[PDB]
Every structure is written in C-alpha cells, then in structure tokens.
Amino acid sequence: EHLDAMQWINGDGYLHNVFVRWFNGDVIRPKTWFWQDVKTRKILGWRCDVSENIDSIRLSFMDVVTRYGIPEDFHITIDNTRGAANKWLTGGAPNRYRFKVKEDDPKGLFLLMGAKMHWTSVVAGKGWGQAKPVERAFGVGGLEEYVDKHPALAGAYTGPYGDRAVDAELFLKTLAEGVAMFNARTGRETEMCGGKLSFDDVFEREYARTIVRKPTEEQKRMLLLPAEAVNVSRKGEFTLKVGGSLKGAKNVYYNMALMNAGVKKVVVRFDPQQLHSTVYCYTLDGRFICEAECL
C-alpha cells in the first residue's frame, strides 16, 4: 500500500548523556520522547523530563496533533518488541509534581483520537516497511550529534557533576535547535529526498497531499494531565502547590465563572509546561467549566 505523511508515526525515547540542572535544582540526565513521521523521517514533536514516563508520550503526542491535525487513517507505533519502551510505559509517582495527579488511561485517549496503536515494528496488512529506519542517522540516535555532542554542552557531556551541569534552559534550547537542524539538513539519502532534499522539504511537499482534521478543544484538553480535585473558595480561586520535578511554587488560579456558578471542588487539567499560565477546570463528573489564569 501507499503511505501518506502523518499516516504512520513512530514513538521513540532517548536517554541523554548530559548532566543538567533541572528547574527544581536537581542535577539529572534528561530523557526525551520523540514522535517521528515514518514516511519523511521528520521529527514532529517531543517532551523532555527528569525520567522516563507516560507523561512525555502523552504530551508530545498532544503537541503533534495540535500542530498538524489528525489524519483520517492514523497509525501509531511504540515498538516494545525487546521491552525497550517498558520504563516509558509507566505512570510515575502520583505525586511527581507534588500535588496529586488523578490516575487515568492514556491508551483509551489515543484510541479515542482515532489512532490505531501498534506495539511492533510493522503495521499488519500494509507493506509500509518498518517504523525505525535502518540508518541510525535517520532516527532519534542521529540527534546526538546536534544535541549531546554540541560544543556548548561539552562540559556536561558524560558519554555513553554539580559544577559541570548545564542549565535546563540551555539544554532545552540546544535540543530544540538540534531538532530543527536535523529536519532542515539537506542531502538526505532516502527515496523521498533522493539525496537532495531535507526531511522538512519532503514533509511540506507530502503533507500538502494528505487529508487531516483539526482536533477539537475538548480532544486537545483530554490529553492534558488530570490533577485530583481542589477546593474553590467563594472568590472563585483555588491553589496548586507546585513542586516535585517542577520549580516549587504555590500557584493561585482564578476565573469569575467559578464563583458565579455552582462548585466547591474542581478537577484541573494542565500541561506541566503551562502551569504558570492557563489550566482547565472540570466538574467532578467531567463537565468542562472554564479555564483559569495563574494570578
């Protein structure tokens, strides 16, 4: 069969060999999850964190569908043949962000998005080939040249440290630029690129020949993490004591609709990266109420 851009995406992980001082002050080795388009080899999204966990899988996917939309025939692969995604397929401590996070099921969420999940290197019934490229350079490993071995992180690079540790902000900027350069690099030796184009070129060309649908706000919000219900004061404000892997803070959120309505408790959906600005409030039974701004 024929393969469209975005029709089949591969999820892969990467344990970085660089010591980084994270937002909470701890010096750790970051782990990043990447979603890659199988046809063009373009990296479409990622999330990096202190450890391997489902949160990164779930949130990087959200980034991909928000940015490119959802194709009508969508295949997703997380090759756990040799148990390589095992640590990633594990919900972290329920209090990894200090405040407690509600236990839910991401698997259910993907299937609802209209994604056919696969746990092997191939898609049954289609002669599309394999998820991971045979050429290490066309996959996630090819990024070590642009990231882990970038001159700027050389002091913190350990290879396959409180004084050497580089800042989380510098590492994350370097990661984002390495991904950009990996995609834009021309002269790619693949069928689509013919030794001339970059992954970006072929992706832009083929993506324009694909039929995708944009995700609704609700869909996008269902991929956000659910925190255990917090109380709302009479003023329509509630608090989240942020911490764990994130920089400690006692965040207070607000929205008029919260007081001028009926609720005492509310379930908060959030993106760890946006905790500082906007979260989404839901009733204990799941009805969306409104979004709240960090005061």
Side-chain angles (χ1 to χ4, degrees), residues 1-81 83-160 162-163 165-188 190-212 214-263 265-295:
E1 189 178 295
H2 171 256
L3 173 48
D4 282 323
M6 283 283 294
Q7 184 168 15
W8 185 15
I9 68 166
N10 184 56
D12 204 10
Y14 194 78
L15 166 37
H16 288 98
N17 287 319
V18 173
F19 278 114
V20 174
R21 185 166 294 278
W22 207 241
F23 308 120
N24 63 4
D26 293 354
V27 170
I28 45 74
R29 295 179 102 184
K31 286 82 183 176
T32 306
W33 185 262
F34 303 94
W35 283 111
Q36 171 174 66
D37 178 47
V38 168
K39 185 187 200 195
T40 69
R41 290 309 175 182
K42 182 177 178 181
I43 289 171
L44 310 167
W46 72 94
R47 286 300 183 114
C48 176
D49 197 17
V50 305
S51 60
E52 306 97 328
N53 77 117
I54 288 188
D55 291 4
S56 295
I57 300 182
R58 175 189 195 140
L59 299 154
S60 55
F61 181 65
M62 187 190 72
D63 291 340
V64 170
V65 305
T66 298
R67 208 192 294 93
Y68 305 108
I70 308 162
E72 307 197 359
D73 193 271
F74 202 21
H75 289 247
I76 291 182
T77 293
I78 295 184
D79 185 20
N80 204 33
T81 284
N86 278 339
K87 291 170 193 182
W88 290 97
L89 300 164
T90 284
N95 68 315
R96 63 203 175 271
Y97 300 125
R98 192 186 165 128
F99 62 83
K100 199 199 308 175
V101 170
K102 282 165 65 181
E103 165 196 324
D104 65 358
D105 179 45
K107 281 78 176 193
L109 302 167
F110 282 67
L111 180 49
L112 280 175
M113 291 293 278
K116 304 165 188 185
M117 183 74 89
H118 301 275
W119 302 97
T120 53
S121 27
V122 300
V123 177
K126 306 199 170 198
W128 287 345
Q130 296 177 304
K132 273 93 171 294
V134 303
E135 177 57 66
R136 168 185 179 77
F138 299 172
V140 162
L143 286 163
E144 69 188 337
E145 273 192 343
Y146 294 102
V147 189
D148 293 24
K149 300 186 175 192
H150 184 104
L153 316 174
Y157 183 54
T158 51
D163 201 19
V166 298
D167 218 80
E169 199 182 345
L170 175 67
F171 174 69
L172 284 162
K173 183 185 67 63
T174 301
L175 207 203
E177 299 173 341
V179 174
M181 288 191 267
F182 173 96
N183 287 336
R185 168 177 164 161
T186 53
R188 291 308 195 160
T190 61
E191 186 184 303
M192 284 285 99
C193 292
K196 300 156 169 178
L197 312 186
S198 65
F199 295 152
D200 274 341
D201 291 321
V202 295
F203 183 89
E204 210 44 54
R205 181 188 75 193
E206 306 292 340
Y207 177 71
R209 301 199 289 237
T210 199
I211 300 167
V212 303
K214 284 309 178 183
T216 51
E217 296 299 311
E218 195 60 50
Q219 287 172 306
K220 295 152 55 184
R221 292 193 231 108
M222 276 302 107
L223 288 175
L224 289 181
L225 307 175
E228 296 274 8
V230 297
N231 291 126
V232 188
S233 74
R234 311 187 187 110
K235 300 173 294 179
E237 314 180 335
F238 56 89
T239 301
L240 288 184
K241 292 174 183 61
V242 179
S245 60
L246 309 177
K247 188 168 298 182
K250 188 197 171 199
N251 286 14
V252 170
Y253 309 77
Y254 170 69
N255 190 297
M256 202 171 76
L258 282 175
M259 61 187 302
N260 303 160
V263 261
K265 283 184 164 298
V266 83
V267 175
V268 179
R269 286 224 167 238
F270 69 96
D271 174 338
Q273 293 194 332
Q274 305 297 307
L275 272 178
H276 64 274
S277 65
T278 306
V279 292
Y280 308 83
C281 313
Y282 283 75
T283 64
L284 285 183
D285 55 286
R287 299 196 313 289
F288 176 61
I289 301 177
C290 53
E291 52 193 76
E293 304 300 321
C294 193
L295 288 195

Short mmCIF file of all heavy atoms in Angstrom, two decimals, residues 155-212, unseen atoms left out:
data_model
loop_
_atom_site.label_atom_id
_atom_site.label_comp_id
_atom_site.label_asym_id
_atom_site.label_seq_id
_atom_site.Cartn_x
_atom_site.Cartn_y
_atom_site.Cartn_z
N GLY A 155 30.93 20.45 28.32
CA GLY A 155 31.39 20.43 29.69
C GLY A 155 30.54 19.50 30.55
O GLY A 155 31.02 18.98 31.57
N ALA A 156 29.29 19.29 30.13
CA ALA A 156 28.39 18.44 30.88
C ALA A 156 28.19 17.07 30.25
O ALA A 156 27.54 16.21 30.85
CB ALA A 156 27.07 19.14 31.04
N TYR A 157 28.71 16.87 29.05
CA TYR A 157 28.59 15.61 28.34
C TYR A 157 29.35 14.53 29.09
O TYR A 157 30.47 14.74 29.51
CB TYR A 157 29.17 15.75 26.93
CG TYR A 157 29.04 14.52 26.07
CD1 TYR A 157 27.80 13.90 25.88
CD2 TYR A 157 30.15 13.95 25.46
CE1 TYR A 157 27.67 12.74 25.09
CE2 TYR A 157 30.04 12.80 24.68
CZ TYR A 157 28.80 12.20 24.50
OH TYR A 157 28.70 11.03 23.75
N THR A 158 28.73 13.38 29.29
CA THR A 158 29.38 12.28 30.00
C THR A 158 29.78 11.15 29.08
O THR A 158 30.72 10.38 29.35
CB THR A 158 28.42 11.69 31.02
OG1 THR A 158 27.18 11.39 30.38
CG2 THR A 158 28.17 12.66 32.08
N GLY A 159 29.03 11.01 28.00
CA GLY A 159 29.29 9.94 27.06
C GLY A 159 28.47 8.75 27.50
O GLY A 159 27.97 8.72 28.64
N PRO A 160 28.33 7.74 26.63
CA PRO A 160 27.56 6.51 26.88
C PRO A 160 28.06 5.74 28.09
O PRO A 160 27.95 4.52 28.13
CB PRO A 160 27.77 5.72 25.59
CG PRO A 160 29.15 6.17 25.12
CD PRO A 160 29.05 7.66 25.33
N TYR A 161 28.10 15.85 39.38
CA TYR A 161 28.62 16.76 38.36
C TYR A 161 28.01 18.16 38.54
O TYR A 161 27.84 18.92 37.58
CB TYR A 161 28.30 16.20 36.97
N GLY A 162 27.74 18.48 39.80
CA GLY A 162 27.14 19.75 40.18
C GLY A 162 27.83 21.00 39.66
O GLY A 162 27.19 22.06 39.55
N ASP A 163 29.12 20.92 39.38
CA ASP A 163 29.80 22.10 38.87
C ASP A 163 29.71 22.19 37.34
O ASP A 163 29.57 23.28 36.78
CB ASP A 163 31.26 22.15 39.32
CG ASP A 163 31.84 23.57 39.25
OD1 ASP A 163 31.04 24.54 39.22
OD2 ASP A 163 33.09 23.72 39.25
N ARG A 164 29.72 21.03 36.69
CA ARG A 164 29.66 20.95 35.24
C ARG A 164 28.24 21.05 34.68
O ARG A 164 28.04 21.50 33.55
CB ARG A 164 30.32 19.63 34.77
N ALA A 165 27.27 20.56 35.44
CA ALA A 165 25.89 20.56 34.99
C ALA A 165 25.47 21.86 34.31
O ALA A 165 25.70 22.94 34.84
CB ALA A 165 24.97 20.24 36.16
N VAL A 166 24.90 21.75 33.10
CA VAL A 166 24.41 22.91 32.36
C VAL A 166 22.97 23.15 32.76
O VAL A 166 22.25 22.22 33.13
CB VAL A 166 24.46 22.76 30.80
CG1 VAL A 166 25.88 22.57 30.31
CG2 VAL A 166 23.55 21.62 30.33
N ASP A 167 22.52 24.37 32.57
CA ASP A 167 21.18 24.75 32.96
C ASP A 167 20.13 24.09 32.09
O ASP A 167 20.37 23.87 30.90
CB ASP A 167 21.06 26.26 32.87
CG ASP A 167 20.23 26.83 33.98
OD1 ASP A 167 20.76 27.00 35.12
OD2 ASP A 167 19.03 27.09 33.73
N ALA A 168 18.97 23.79 32.68
CA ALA A 168 17.85 23.18 31.95
C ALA A 168 17.45 24.03 30.75
O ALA A 168 17.19 23.51 29.67
CB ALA A 168 16.67 23.01 32.86
N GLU A 169 17.43 25.35 30.93
CA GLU A 169 17.06 26.25 29.85
C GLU A 169 18.02 26.21 28.64
O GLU A 169 17.58 26.31 27.49
CB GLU A 169 16.92 27.66 30.40
CG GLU A 169 16.10 28.55 29.49
CD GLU A 169 15.98 29.99 30.00
OE1 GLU A 169 16.30 30.21 31.20
OE2 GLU A 169 15.56 30.89 29.21
N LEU A 170 19.31 26.05 28.90
CA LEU A 170 20.30 25.96 27.82
C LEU A 170 20.20 24.61 27.09
O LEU A 170 20.31 24.55 25.87
CB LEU A 170 21.72 26.13 28.38
CG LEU A 170 22.86 25.94 27.38
CD1 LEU A 170 22.81 27.09 26.39
CD2 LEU A 170 24.20 25.93 28.09
N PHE A 171 20.03 23.53 27.85
CA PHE A 171 19.90 22.20 27.30
C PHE A 171 18.68 22.15 26.40
O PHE A 171 18.75 21.71 25.25
CB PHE A 171 19.73 21.16 28.40
CG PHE A 171 19.45 19.78 27.87
CD1 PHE A 171 20.43 19.08 27.19
CD2 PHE A 171 18.18 19.24 27.96
CE1 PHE A 171 20.16 17.86 26.60
CE2 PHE A 171 17.89 18.02 27.36
CZ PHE A 171 18.89 17.32 26.67
N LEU A 172 17.55 22.62 26.92
CA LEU A 172 16.30 22.63 26.18
C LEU A 172 16.33 23.51 24.94
O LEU A 172 15.59 23.26 23.99
CB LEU A 172 15.14 22.99 27.11
CG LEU A 172 14.70 21.85 28.03
CD1 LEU A 172 13.88 22.38 29.20
CD2 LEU A 172 13.91 20.82 27.24
N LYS A 173 17.14 24.56 24.93
CA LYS A 173 17.24 25.41 23.75
C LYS A 173 18.07 24.64 22.70
O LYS A 173 17.72 24.58 21.52
CB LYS A 173 17.95 26.71 24.11
CG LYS A 173 18.04 27.69 22.96
CD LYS A 173 18.86 28.93 23.31
CE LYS A 173 20.34 28.59 23.53
NZ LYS A 173 20.96 28.06 22.28
N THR A 174 19.15 24.02 23.15
CA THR A 174 20.04 23.23 22.31
C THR A 174 19.34 22.03 21.68
O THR A 174 19.60 21.68 20.52
CB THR A 174 21.23 22.77 23.14
OG1 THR A 174 21.90 23.93 23.66
CG2 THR A 174 22.17 21.94 22.32
N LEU A 175 18.43 21.40 22.44
CA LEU A 175 17.64 20.27 21.98
C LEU A 175 16.70 20.75 20.86
O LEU A 175 16.60 20.14 19.79
CB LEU A 175 16.78 19.78 23.13
CG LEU A 175 16.30 18.33 23.23
CD1 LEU A 175 15.06 18.31 24.09
CD2 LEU A 175 16.06 17.70 21.87
N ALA A 176 15.99 21.84 21.11
CA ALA A 176 15.07 22.37 20.13
C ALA A 176 15.79 22.76 18.82
O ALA A 176 15.25 22.57 17.73
CB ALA A 176 14.29 23.55 20.71
N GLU A 177 16.98 23.34 18.94
CA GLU A 177 17.74 23.73 17.75
C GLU A 177 18.31 22.52 17.02
O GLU A 177 18.36 22.51 15.79
CB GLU A 177 18.85 24.70 18.11
CG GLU A 177 18.33 25.97 18.72
CD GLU A 177 19.44 26.86 19.25
OE1 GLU A 177 20.58 26.38 19.48
OE2 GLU A 177 19.15 28.07 19.45
N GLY A 178 18.72 21.50 17.78
CA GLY A 178 19.24 20.28 17.18
C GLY A 178 18.16 19.59 16.38
O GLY A 178 18.42 19.06 15.32
N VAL A 179 16.92 19.63 16.87
CA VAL A 179 15.82 19.02 16.16
C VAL A 179 15.56 19.80 14.88
O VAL A 179 15.34 19.23 13.82
CB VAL A 179 14.51 18.98 16.98
CG1 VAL A 179 13.38 18.45 16.13
CG2 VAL A 179 14.69 18.09 18.20
N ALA A 180 15.56 21.12 14.99
CA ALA A 180 15.33 21.96 13.82
C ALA A 180 16.37 21.70 12.72
O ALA A 180 16.02 21.63 11.54
CB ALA A 180 15.33 23.41 14.22
N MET A 181 17.64 21.57 13.12
CA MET A 181 18.75 21.33 12.19
C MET A 181 18.72 19.93 11.61
O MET A 181 19.11 19.71 10.47
CB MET A 181 20.11 21.59 12.85
CG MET A 181 20.41 23.08 13.10
SD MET A 181 22.12 23.38 13.59
CE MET A 181 21.94 23.33 15.30
N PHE A 182 18.25 18.97 12.40
CA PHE A 182 18.13 17.59 11.95
C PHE A 182 17.11 17.55 10.82
O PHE A 182 17.33 16.92 9.80
CB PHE A 182 17.69 16.70 13.13
CG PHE A 182 17.38 15.26 12.77
CD1 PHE A 182 18.34 14.26 12.92
CD2 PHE A 182 16.11 14.89 12.37
CE1 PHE A 182 18.03 12.92 12.67
CE2 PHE A 182 15.79 13.56 12.12
CZ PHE A 182 16.75 12.58 12.27
N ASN A 183 15.99 18.25 10.98
CA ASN A 183 14.94 18.27 9.97
C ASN A 183 15.31 19.03 8.71
O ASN A 183 14.93 18.62 7.61
CB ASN A 183 13.64 18.88 10.53
CG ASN A 183 12.92 17.96 11.49
OD1 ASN A 183 13.09 16.73 11.46
ND2 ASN A 183 12.12 18.55 12.35
N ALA A 184 15.98 20.17 8.87
CA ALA A 184 16.37 21.02 7.75
C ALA A 184 17.59 20.58 6.94
O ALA A 184 17.82 21.10 5.86
CB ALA A 184 16.57 22.42 8.24
N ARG A 185 18.37 19.64 7.46
CA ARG A 185 19.57 19.17 6.78
C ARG A 185 19.27 18.52 5.42
O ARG A 185 18.55 17.51 5.33
CB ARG A 185 20.30 18.20 7.70
CG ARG A 185 21.40 17.38 7.11
CD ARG A 185 21.99 16.57 8.24
NE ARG A 185 22.81 15.47 7.75
CZ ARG A 185 23.73 14.83 8.47
NH1 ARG A 185 23.96 15.16 9.73
NH2 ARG A 185 24.42 13.84 7.92
N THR A 186 19.79 19.13 4.36
CA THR A 186 19.58 18.65 3.01
C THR A 186 20.56 17.56 2.64
O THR A 186 21.48 17.27 3.40
CB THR A 186 19.73 19.77 2.02
OG1 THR A 186 20.98 20.42 2.24
CG2 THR A 186 18.63 20.79 2.18
N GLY A 187 20.36 16.94 1.48
CA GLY A 187 21.25 15.88 1.04
C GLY A 187 20.93 14.53 1.65
O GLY A 187 21.79 13.65 1.69
N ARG A 188 19.69 14.36 2.12
CA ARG A 188 19.24 13.12 2.74
C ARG A 188 19.15 11.97 1.73
O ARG A 188 18.47 12.07 0.71
CB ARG A 188 17.87 13.33 3.40
CG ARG A 188 17.89 14.22 4.62
CD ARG A 188 18.93 13.76 5.59
NE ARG A 188 18.74 14.37 6.90
CZ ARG A 188 19.25 13.87 8.02
NH1 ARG A 188 19.98 12.76 7.97
NH2 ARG A 188 19.04 14.48 9.18
N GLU A 189 19.79 10.86 2.06
CA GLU A 189 19.82 9.70 1.19
C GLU A 189 18.65 8.74 1.46
O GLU A 189 18.82 7.67 2.05
CB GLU A 189 21.18 8.97 1.32
N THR A 190 17.46 9.14 1.06
CA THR A 190 16.27 8.32 1.23
C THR A 190 15.52 8.43 -0.09
O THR A 190 15.78 9.34 -0.87
CB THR A 190 15.36 8.84 2.36
OG1 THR A 190 14.92 10.16 2.05
CG2 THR A 190 16.10 8.89 3.67
N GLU A 191 14.56 7.55 -0.32
CA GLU A 191 13.79 7.60 -1.55
C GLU A 191 13.08 8.94 -1.77
O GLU A 191 13.19 9.55 -2.83
CB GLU A 191 12.79 6.44 -1.62
CG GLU A 191 12.03 6.35 -2.97
CD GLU A 191 10.97 5.25 -3.00
OE1 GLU A 191 11.34 4.07 -2.75
OE2 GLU A 191 9.78 5.57 -3.28
N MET A 192 12.37 9.41 -0.74
CA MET A 192 11.63 10.68 -0.80
C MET A 192 12.49 11.92 -1.11
O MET A 192 12.06 12.82 -1.84
CB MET A 192 10.90 10.90 0.53
CG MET A 192 9.67 10.07 0.73
SD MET A 192 8.32 10.72 -0.26
CE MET A 192 8.36 9.63 -1.66
N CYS A 193 13.67 11.97 -0.50
CA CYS A 193 14.60 13.08 -0.65
C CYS A 193 15.58 12.96 -1.82
O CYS A 193 16.18 13.96 -2.23
CB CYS A 193 15.39 13.27 0.65
SG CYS A 193 14.39 13.85 2.02
N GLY A 194 15.79 11.73 -2.29
CA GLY A 194 16.68 11.49 -3.41
C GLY A 194 18.05 12.09 -3.27
O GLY A 194 18.59 12.59 -4.24
N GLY A 195 18.61 12.06 -2.07
CA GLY A 195 19.93 12.61 -1.85
C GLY A 195 20.01 14.12 -2.00
O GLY A 195 21.08 14.70 -1.88
N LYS A 196 18.87 14.78 -2.21
CA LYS A 196 18.88 16.23 -2.39
C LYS A 196 18.16 17.01 -1.28
O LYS A 196 18.72 17.92 -0.67
CB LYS A 196 18.20 16.61 -3.71
CG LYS A 196 18.81 16.08 -5.00
CD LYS A 196 17.69 16.06 -6.07
CE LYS A 196 18.20 15.80 -7.49
NZ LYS A 196 17.06 15.76 -8.47
N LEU A 197 16.90 16.67 -1.04
CA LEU A 197 16.10 17.37 -0.06
C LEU A 197 16.32 17.01 1.40
O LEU A 197 17.04 16.05 1.73
CB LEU A 197 14.61 17.21 -0.41
CG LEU A 197 14.12 17.47 -1.84
CD1 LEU A 197 12.59 17.38 -1.82
CD2 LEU A 197 14.56 18.85 -2.38
N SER A 198 15.72 17.82 2.26
CA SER A 198 15.77 17.64 3.71
C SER A 198 14.42 17.03 4.13
O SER A 198 13.45 17.04 3.37
CB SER A 198 15.94 18.99 4.41
OG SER A 198 14.82 19.83 4.19
N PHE A 199 14.33 16.53 5.36
CA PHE A 199 13.09 15.94 5.84
C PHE A 199 11.97 16.97 5.82
O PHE A 199 10.83 16.65 5.52
CB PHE A 199 13.29 15.36 7.23
CG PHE A 199 14.26 14.22 7.25
CD1 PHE A 199 15.01 13.94 8.39
CD2 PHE A 199 14.40 13.41 6.13
CE1 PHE A 199 15.91 12.85 8.40
CE2 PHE A 199 15.27 12.34 6.14
CZ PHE A 199 16.03 12.05 7.27
N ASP A 200 12.32 18.22 6.09
CA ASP A 200 11.36 19.31 6.07
C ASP A 200 10.77 19.52 4.69
O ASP A 200 9.58 19.71 4.57
CB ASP A 200 12.03 20.61 6.53
CG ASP A 200 12.01 20.78 8.03
OD1 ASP A 200 11.21 20.14 8.73
OD2 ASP A 200 12.78 21.60 8.54
N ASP A 201 11.62 19.51 3.66
CA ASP A 201 11.20 19.68 2.27
C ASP A 201 10.18 18.62 1.88
O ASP A 201 9.10 18.93 1.41
CB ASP A 201 12.38 19.51 1.30
CG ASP A 201 13.41 20.64 1.39
OD1 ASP A 201 13.02 21.82 1.54
OD2 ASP A 201 14.62 20.36 1.25
N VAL A 202 10.53 17.35 2.08
CA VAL A 202 9.62 16.29 1.71
C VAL A 202 8.38 16.28 2.56
O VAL A 202 7.29 15.94 2.08
CB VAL A 202 10.30 14.94 1.72
CG1 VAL A 202 11.37 14.92 0.64
CG2 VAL A 202 10.93 14.68 3.07
N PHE A 203 8.50 16.68 3.81
CA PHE A 203 7.31 16.71 4.64
C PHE A 203 6.33 17.79 4.17
O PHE A 203 5.12 17.54 4.05
CB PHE A 203 7.66 16.92 6.11
CG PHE A 203 6.47 16.89 7.02
CD1 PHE A 203 6.03 15.68 7.57
CD2 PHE A 203 5.76 18.06 7.29
CE1 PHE A 203 4.91 15.64 8.38
CE2 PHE A 203 4.64 18.03 8.09
CZ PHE A 203 4.21 16.82 8.64
N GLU A 204 6.84 18.97 3.85
CA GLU A 204 5.99 20.04 3.39
C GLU A 204 5.33 19.70 2.07
O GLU A 204 4.18 20.07 1.83
CB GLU A 204 6.76 21.35 3.31
CG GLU A 204 5.88 22.58 3.55
CD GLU A 204 4.92 22.38 4.74
OE1 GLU A 204 5.40 22.04 5.85
OE2 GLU A 204 3.69 22.54 4.56
N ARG A 205 6.05 18.98 1.22
CA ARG A 205 5.54 18.57 -0.08
C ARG A 205 4.43 17.52 0.05
O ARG A 205 3.35 17.68 -0.50
CB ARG A 205 6.68 18.02 -0.94
CG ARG A 205 6.30 17.58 -2.36
CD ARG A 205 7.48 16.86 -3.07
NE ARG A 205 7.73 15.49 -2.58
CZ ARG A 205 8.82 14.77 -2.85
NH1 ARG A 205 9.80 15.27 -3.61
NH2 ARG A 205 8.93 13.52 -2.39
N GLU A 206 4.69 16.46 0.82
CA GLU A 206 3.73 15.38 1.01
C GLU A 206 2.59 15.72 1.94
O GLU A 206 1.47 15.22 1.78
CB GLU A 206 4.44 14.16 1.54
CG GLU A 206 5.61 13.73 0.70
CD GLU A 206 5.17 13.21 -0.65
OE1 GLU A 206 4.00 12.82 -0.78
OE2 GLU A 206 6.02 13.16 -1.56
N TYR A 207 2.86 16.54 2.94
CA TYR A 207 1.82 16.89 3.89
C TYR A 207 0.69 17.64 3.17
O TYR A 207 -0.48 17.52 3.54
CB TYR A 207 2.42 17.71 5.02
CG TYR A 207 1.41 18.20 6.03
CD1 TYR A 207 0.79 17.33 6.93
CD2 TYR A 207 1.10 19.55 6.11
CE1 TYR A 207 -0.11 17.80 7.87
CE2 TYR A 207 0.21 20.02 7.04
CZ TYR A 207 -0.39 19.15 7.92
OH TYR A 207 -1.26 19.68 8.85
N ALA A 208 1.03 18.40 2.14
CA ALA A 208 0.03 19.14 1.38
C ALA A 208 -0.87 18.21 0.54
O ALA A 208 -1.87 18.66 -0.02
CB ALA A 208 0.71 20.15 0.48
N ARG A 209 -0.48 16.94 0.44
CA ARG A 209 -1.23 15.92 -0.30
C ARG A 209 -1.87 14.91 0.65
O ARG A 209 -2.14 13.79 0.26
CB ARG A 209 -0.29 15.16 -1.23
CG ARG A 209 0.40 16.03 -2.24
CD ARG A 209 0.91 15.21 -3.38
NE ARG A 209 2.06 14.37 -3.04
CZ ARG A 209 3.23 14.44 -3.68
NH1 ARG A 209 3.40 15.32 -4.67
NH2 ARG A 209 4.21 13.60 -3.37
N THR A 210 -2.11 15.32 1.89
CA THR A 210 -2.68 14.44 2.90
C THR A 210 -3.97 15.08 3.45
O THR A 210 -4.12 16.31 3.44
CB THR A 210 -1.65 14.22 4.05
OG1 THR A 210 -1.99 13.05 4.80
CG2 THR A 210 -1.64 15.39 4.98
N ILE A 211 -4.90 14.25 3.90
CA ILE A 211 -6.18 14.74 4.43
C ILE A 211 -6.19 14.59 5.95
O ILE A 211 -6.23 13.47 6.47
CB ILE A 211 -7.36 13.96 3.79
CG1 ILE A 211 -7.34 14.15 2.27
CG2 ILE A 211 -8.67 14.44 4.35
CD1 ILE A 211 -8.21 13.23 1.53
N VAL A 212 -6.10 15.72 6.66
CA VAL A 212 -6.11 15.70 8.12
C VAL A 212 -7.27 16.51 8.65
O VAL A 212 -7.85 17.33 7.93
CB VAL A 212 -4.80 16.26 8.74
CG1 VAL A 212 -3.61 15.49 8.25
CG2 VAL A 212 -4.64 17.73 8.45
#
